[PDB]
Amino acid sequence: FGVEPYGQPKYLEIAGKRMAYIDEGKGDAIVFQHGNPTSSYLWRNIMPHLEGLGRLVACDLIGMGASDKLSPSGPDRYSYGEQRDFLFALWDALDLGDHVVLVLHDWGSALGFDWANQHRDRVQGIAFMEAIVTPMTWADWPPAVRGVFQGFRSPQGEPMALEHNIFVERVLPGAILRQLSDEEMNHYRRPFVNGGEDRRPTLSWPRNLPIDGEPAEVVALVNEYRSWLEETDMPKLFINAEPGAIITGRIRDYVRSWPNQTEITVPGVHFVQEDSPEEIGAAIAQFVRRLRSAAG
Numbered sequence: 001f002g003v004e005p006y007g008q009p010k011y012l013e014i015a016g017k018r019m020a021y022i023d024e025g026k027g028d029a030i031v032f033q034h035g036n037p038t039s040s041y042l043w044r045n046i047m048p049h050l051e052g053l054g055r056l057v058a059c060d061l062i063g064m065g066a067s068d069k070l071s072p073s074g075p076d077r078y079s080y081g082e083q084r085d086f087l088f089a090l091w092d093a094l095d096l097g098d099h100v101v102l103v104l105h106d107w108g109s110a111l112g113f114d115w116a117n118q119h120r121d122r123v124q125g126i127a128f129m130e131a132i133v134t135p136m137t138w139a140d141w142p143p144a145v146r147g148v149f150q151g152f153r154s155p156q157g158e159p160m161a162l163e164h165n166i167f168v169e170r171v172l173p174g175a176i177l178r179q180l181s182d183e184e185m186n187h188y189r190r191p192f193v194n195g196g197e198d199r200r201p202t203l204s205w206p207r208n209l210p211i212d213g214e215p216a217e218v219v220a221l222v223n224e225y226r227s228w229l230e231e232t233d234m235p236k237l238f239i240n241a242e243p244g245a246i247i248t249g250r251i252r253d254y255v256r257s258w259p260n261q262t263e264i265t266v267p268g269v270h271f272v273q274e275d276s277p278e279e280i281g282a283a284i285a286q287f288v289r290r291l292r293s294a295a296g
């Protein structure tokens with residue numbers, strides 16, 4: 001398992017803030033989008049498998065990775081909508097073209113599914129894993145972390161995330177089967193070393209999860225994009241994980257019903273890239289080669 005980040009960090013100023021990203025190679029874009037509490041670092045052992053198959057792009061969400069922190073920060077910042085505002089502006093600035101393959105995880109999947117739904121004629125295929133695909137109930141959520149996530153979604157969330165860094169220190173390793181090396185963990189810790197508001201994105205994200213009907217605007221968003229995913233003939237690559245975390249049970253059955261979908265099942269909990277990068281990267285490469293073939 002490689003420890004070095006992939007590529008060279010690049011930056012653009014987007015809506016007053018510097019956003020960091022990786023952009024390597026030529027061709028049609030293959031866009032990798034991380035979620036909480038990760039960064040483009042999550043994709044470092046996956047991206048090499050796509051070399052020569054396209055222009056490999058991986059952005060760091062606002063407040064995350066090497067991207068700037070918002071200021072002043074507080075409970076009203078880093079909502080889904082704000083995250084979308086920055087990311088969608090960065091993707092526009094990058095001139096991705098009209099044959100995009102998205103490779104999505106966690107909140108990256110909500111953002112990327114929303115983008116694809118809004119730009120259907122520009123997306124060639126979507127690979128996704130451990131993704132937000134439907135409004136949830138607590139029963140859908142991994143038992144081990146129901147209490148923690150409820151905690152984030154209460155006034156206890158500030159000390160949990162801001163002071164104790166629980167998403168980074170506990171949730172992340174808890175949903176990887178292997179033990180990360182110190183070096184790898186320290187890349188994940190890097191954006192969040194300072195206690196306080198630098199950790200806000202890691203709190204705002206769980207507060208946006210669509211669970212038992214709330215928040216209503218994110219439930220609505222997910223219902224809109226999933227209605228399109230269910231009916232579209234756009235090619236899909238569903239990377240299922242065993243035991244998995246957020247795509248299990250009935251949600252796994254639901255996703256399996258979607259059309260024009262290639263499936264794999266690999267070992268992993270939530271951060272599956274850390275347990276099965278070779279399988280995942282190979283699957284994505286195979287999927288993209290089929291798309292290129294079919295495009296002549």
Ligand SMILES: [Cl-]
Pocket residue numbers: 036205206207209
């Ligand atoms: Cl989250």
